[model samples]
Target chain A: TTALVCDNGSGLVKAGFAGDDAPRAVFPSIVGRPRHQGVMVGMGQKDSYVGDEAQSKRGILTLKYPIEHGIITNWDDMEKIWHHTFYNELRVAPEEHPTLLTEAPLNPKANREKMTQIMFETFNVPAMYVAIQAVLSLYASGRTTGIVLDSGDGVTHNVPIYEGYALPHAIMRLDLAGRDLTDYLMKILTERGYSFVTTAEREIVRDIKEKLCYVALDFENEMATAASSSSLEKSYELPDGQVITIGNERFRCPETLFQPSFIGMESAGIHETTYNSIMKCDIDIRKDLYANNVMSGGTTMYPGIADRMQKEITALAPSTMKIKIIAPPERKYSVWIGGSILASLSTFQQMWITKQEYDEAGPSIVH
Target chain B: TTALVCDNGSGLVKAGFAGDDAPRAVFPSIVGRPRHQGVMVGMGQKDSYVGDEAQSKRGILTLKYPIEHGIITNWDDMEKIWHHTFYNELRVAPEEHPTLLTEAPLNPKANREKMTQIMFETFNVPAMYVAIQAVLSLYASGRTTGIVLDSGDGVTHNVPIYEGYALPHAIMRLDLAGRDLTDYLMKILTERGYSFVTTAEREIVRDIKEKLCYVALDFENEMATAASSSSLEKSYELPDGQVITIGNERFRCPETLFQPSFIGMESAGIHETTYNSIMKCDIDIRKDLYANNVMSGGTTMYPGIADRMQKEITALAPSTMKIKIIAPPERKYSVWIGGSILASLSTFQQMWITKQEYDEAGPSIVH
Candidate 1:
């Protein structure tokens, strides 16, 4: 095998060895579901993927992303499952070929060194090259000075690009993203009398969000218009073929985003934040990148997203500035896209420090 | 004194003497406050009221809705609060004059009678008139056969106007309304790292909703787009010029109604449900109502409401059909308008019977 790659983004861990066009596996970084008592371990069964699964048994184990605000601050239970599952699944044996790992941008050097040491201590890889996923995406997409926004399962992080390098200060992360959305869905269910007894159910909620949820531009009016007589008066058969009426409630549901203060958060909108993060960077890089704003992640798939983002960026920037939201085709795989590029290019090897460098730098590098 | 009049639509309640100009007061049936644990009964605080004041304290004991899902469920709580706070705030003691109240369409006769008895026995009212608020709004609006979709603080009820009567089969009530919306907002807050504990914090949540919430006609697209951005990314500078950024995490909170299945309820958009409710009515009536659908509710009082309602309703309606969403000048007080008409009629005296007649009618006829 050329090299077994371990790519972990804020959302998932995708791993495969060499020539696979797609990731061999992509599992959510979260581990262990809500429990009534005690602790459970390992990847939840297929049914444990709650948001999409149709039927879920109560109280199944799930994955919880212990990382808060985009970095792992706490890792009590998650570490257990990560150790066991990745060991077997990745086939990280002592005799394996060198492994290539991915990490977030500006990862504290201490954490990076610890991660590098873990390969030797735990997996015992013959060698390894740890790279930032953001940098990888920049090379893969061939975009310079393009702001990349990742709507990870845990949170949304915006990274400003300059001549293909990620500017850390120009990056901002928020507690808004897929997991927060799932928890919001969970709360609605509980209040409406549906207890999320199973991780599968939780996963189902996430799936429902992907399949059925939408971003309402001017959400209140859209809901009111939608729930009126001409629209909701018609019967809609569910998979079960049951039908019911619709009303103004639709506006109220999605309305939360426009007003974070509704949930008691003191913050700005995603678009404005993205703009500010970009503007805070080197002014020259900011100007070019704002026009070439590239949005990726599981969420950029929302219809009308590009238009909305473009509108907001245009409004925030100087009126003469032209802004565009480049939505990567096959959005679900942008990080993987970068991974594929890294694996395919022989020149990319130049960025990978050889085991010889480690030897020269000494074990002091790990320390 | 002249006989009292009562009108209870799916949205609001109005009571006054027959031939009154309009409702005594029109209140958006929402109550809220900061998250606090208060231990005292009518400690005579200025924070207590019948509308938003009461609606805001949903999770905390200090705030409770005596009426839930368009019916009076918590009678004891109602008596304590309504008599003390609601009634006192309105300053209409039962002893001062006979009273009138209203119930939802096809309300359980037991509930209607119980409500009446409470008015007579508990409040010591010598006389009472009970009726549906929808009927009163219809009377005041003067357009029979138009669909009246009432969105209230606790529930959104779609009441069809057919030959000046409500169609029970066409009526559909979900477990959500403004209160449920607040819960979802709280969950969004929790997921976003705000420790949202009490329901009073819902006021902040409500403030968010009122200022920021909107309805998405095409929910899937809107959510996908929103997911790419931080839901609470908006920020405001206080008088002190402290800048804050809110994310988009909570924006998807209202999207729940468009896809109830997000919460595991196998339902499509609330717009679809609303359209279905109108269709179940007599065809001619449904057609007439569809052309002139009325979107009336506390939830409807948002910017872009008419456009949103129009978009969804037009999409769901038969391609050949034309639709319109109109709100009366006193849009918030439509039900009061209905009650005003009902109360002002020359023969209105017969609509209201004494406590003795309520005893004879077994509440069924009275209801």
Candidate 2:
């Protein structure tokens, strides 16, 4: 039977069949309520929209994100998002495919239980396996053990997984991530001859971040040449047609992810957290963790981020040990990729908690 | 032939024969220049003294430490220190015994080659082997692969050794160690109605640190219950009969190791450095690193430092991977013990850099 993998991230919901390199459908994890205005197309709906369809009704729609910090908070909206992804996007019956969903590290027992309850009782996944997001990212990279740095929209997590199991105690979560970078960019731009009319302008900032920003291999050198013609300065024209030139701000904004304290968060930096997570594991496997350091999620998609991360981490690491950062080509879909990999495995059949097991042991069966 | 093992540490030089559980001689790694007027001890008309003999003439002798930050900076002083450890302390004919010496991680290539040259040319030892201190500590714990945290007087190092080779790139060195803790305690006590006059007072503080100080497993709870009767408050009388009371300062002084920023150093704490070092290695062996997390050095002697370190490290590690801290009963001599173990091994006999090999390949053969 074909398996479906749903990487319900904090920002996007990626759903598709197992063995696919990328998700068949990817959209924002939001449901929208359009103001009885220009609501055209999609299931003959008068107001409600899901995923990208909801995002299209932007100004006219009041949007609600079901997931917060990578957890399903509003079950009602989550149910809607799940239904739309399956029925409208995938165009498949959920009852047929065995579903593999991703869960955040240290996800509350209650939350996991509720997730299992919903998957079986509602969508009726033939067989279900809830994999931790960090482990899935590692799986996507074709490694069973390593340190996974997942920089998503809601939070950036440093998780070390050994032999397919996520080490919860070593997992580190940071509040500053993709959304935080966007907001920081907005603040930076506002101070440098640019302004946004609404909070929705975050979309424009995020677009700029993705299109223009990149990590500087030599931060000092980049700063020294920032204003020169050699700089990768780009001019972004917003929806209102106002042009803003981005220069050092490109490197400066993404720099915050590596050094969050620059933006005023006391938490450990990504490199520091990655190192910290690996240290918590057993000594014999530390070499494996370093050799197989994996990077995932959308925020890490910035050009040179992985390279810079590797350099910075290496500089702080043992002079003889080789520090490697393995970033898959489709970082944004890494979790889904890992999920697909797991779901396709013949041995994975024995690992699933199963609908029958869930019925017998309840949600607690996730442990 | 019997082999000799020497752990040339920042604080002390521990030398002994192979197959022994401990060093035959352990004393400060200092050479004393005696004043012409008060040189009355040991062999008559001595210009200087080594080890305990040097310390015995405290006030009258000007002492110099050959090792700086765990590296031999003063070659002449280091030579004398080595000579004294063998001839005066170990009471051995250097020519008869195959020598095994401990080298600090990242010891300069020049220094290592110089050491081999001296043992072969000057002392004319039959054979010799140089071992990294961190690796020696691991070997002392009966593990060839594991993360070793050696907290000595000058610096604390985190090193991951796999299959007998020390991964130099993965080693982490921190300045905040035994010396820093001693200084911090002096500051803490100075603020708490106590003061010391002579440099010798540092030895008393060190004694207090070893005998009285401990790491607070629950720092906040320990602080909250600090002044209570349940606290391990003790009174120490200085040489001048000045009584100083120690309560929460016992744990607070050691807390700086975990939170070096708490003492204003712009460096990662011990636990963080340990983790960072492991993360710098390949991801496959982190579990082994954690499982065999070995701690050594004189500074690690604080009552609860190992337990506290293990607890703190585990708190930040993956819950699934058990965090184990392997600390030998005599951490200060761990390197010497490891050297002893290596020197005693029949298998290790074939591995020694023989005098003839050294003569043929030159000192570069040490590498």
Candidate 3:
């Protein structure tokens, strides 16, 4: 049977069929209903949007972020996003394919049950497998046992997966992540005499953060060099044709990950969090973990992030230990790729909680 | 050579000789100077006190906590505490014994250097080995590589040690700890019409938390039973001859560790912290970490903590993975016990930084 694989992240929903190298469809984990536009004036009919479509129409739409802190808290919005992915994006009937989804570690059991119930009762899929995103990322990297550092939109998770199973207790989370950087960039711009009049301007700020911002290996040096040279600056024009010169703000935005106290979150840097996670395991496997360190998620796309992580971790780690960071060419789709890989495996076929079994055991069948 | 071991913690200082099963002396990690008792009318003179002596003379003694959040921040007070531990408590000259001091993970390099400086310069320690307390706790449990959950007087740290080195980055800390519980109990008692006039009365609340309190396996069930019967209640007579009835407070106090939101910290419970720390490691060694989970600290002495931890962890862990918690009989002295073991080993001899080396390289030699 053809299988549909999706990595349901707090930031985006990456969905595609099994055996695909990347997601066929990608959208934000948000739903939006038109507040003023796309509605029949008298008939009371309104158009809804998901992901970029909704984000693009921010002024006209009332948006809802369904997932909070990397966990599904609103079932209605989640279900809506799932429907958008399956019917609107993929244009496929759920019943025609077995499905696989990825979830964050320490997800509530009730959430699992609800997911199972929704899949079986609402979508009526043939089979379903809910895998931890970290495990999927590791699978995407072709290692079943390693440390997976996934820095997504809302939160950065350092998860260790062993033999396809996530050690739920050992997961580490950071509050300073993608959106925080975007907000930080906006804050810096506002202080530097750039003012955003509308919430839609967030999209512009996000674009600036993505295109200009980079994780600096040495923040002081980057600032010093950037300050002295106009060559280091980039000019980005807003939708209204106002050009803003990006200088030190480029490295300053992403620097919050390393120095989170600037954002008021009293926590260690991502590299430290990653090292702490690997250190929690048995000594015999730490070298292997270090050698097979896999990084995924959109936030990992920051330029020099891999190199900086290697340098910082190497300084703190034992001299004999090798520090390797693997970032897929399509880092954002790493989880999706893993889901695809797992779905294509014949052994993983038996691991699916079939509709027949679901009908027999109810939501508990998902466990 | 007879080796002296000291575990300088936030709440208490535990010290003993090498090869001992437990610390010979344990006292509060606080120093106090007499305000008026020994001072003359014209020529003023003040005497200092440490541990129980200072606590007993609370009315006149100006108390100072040397350690803050499990690290020595006040060098002078810390030096005084060390002197008290060595001379007044253990009754040993520092110069005569090789020293092993246990420190919390992520301790600052400067602090380590300062500690080495003080040990050799002030006390003339012959040799020293400064070990991470979490790693020592794992060593005490007979495992060089495993997860160590140390629920100490001030903070609860979940640390993973592999081959004697601590993974500093992946460590998990909780604001909710032994003192938090003690304070919670104090708050409950104050609300119930019992009052503590002196700060030293914290000892009473702490005793109440330890002797009467326990981690409830199922909080709701325990609460229901506690509410229905008077048998679960106990009465403690204070120094002022006021007896207070501790009813649901017994289970509720320790329950804060599992549900810290009640105490106002927006963080995960201890079980979740334990899980998250392990999840940070590579998957191949997670089961080994799980199987060798070592619990240490005075806070862990609460009844049913181990069983409750086992139950909570088992629920979230893979069905195939075994969840084991190794809590020694003298859990409070686990670090000291490990120090004793290490100091006794001929192999550990080379690990010590000799005084001669310190004389040549100065404080940096500790690194």
| Per-candidate DockQ vs. reference | 0.01, 0.02, 0.05
Q: lDDT per residue, candidate 1, B4-107, as tens digits?
A: 54443323344455456655554444333434445674676555445545553344423445567667666765565445433543556456545556556644
| Residue B9 CA displacement from its true place in model 1, Å | 8.0
Which CAPRI quality tier does the interface of model 1 achieve? incorrect
RMSD of each: 22.9, 17.9, 14.4
Off by over 4 Å in 2: A35-45, A162-169, A228-231, B1-367
Off by over 4 Å in 1: A1-367, B2-61, B85-87, B96-98, B219-221, B224-233, B236-251, B359-364
Cα shift from native, residue B192, model 3 (Å) = 29
Where does candidate 1 chain B have its weakest 10-residue lDDT segment? B6-15
Every prediction's TM-score for the first chain? 0.76, 0.90, 0.91
lDDT of 3 by residue, B1-367 (tens): 6988888776777888888887788788777765443446555323677888887666556567777766666898789878778877779876786888888776568778888888877878887888877777766778888788887875678788777766666798775586666766665664344544234456767777766777787878787787666687788776668777777777777788888766654589888788888888877767788877788865778778888888898888788877788877767778778899888778888888887788786888766
For model 3, the docking class works out as incorrect
User: What value does the lDDT take at residue B36 in candidate 1?
Assistant: 44
Task: Show the lowest summed lDDT stretch of 10 residues, model 1 chain A.
Answer: A47-56
Which sections of candidate 3 miss by over 4 Å? A35-47, A161-170, A197-199, A365-367, B1-297, B300-367
Q: Report the lDDT of model 2 for residue B153.
A: 78
Flag the better candidate by DockQ, 1 or 3: 3
C-alpha lDDT score of every prediction, in listed order: 0.57, 0.75, 0.75
Tens-digit lDDT track of model 1 for A1-367: 4666655554555666654556665655555444445334454554222211212333345545555434565544335434643465554555456566665553344445545655555545566677655555565567766877766564566777777556654556555656665666666655545465555456655654555445565554575567563453333333334443322332233334444544444345577878778766765666677667677755557655566566556667878776777787765666666666675567766655545656676433532
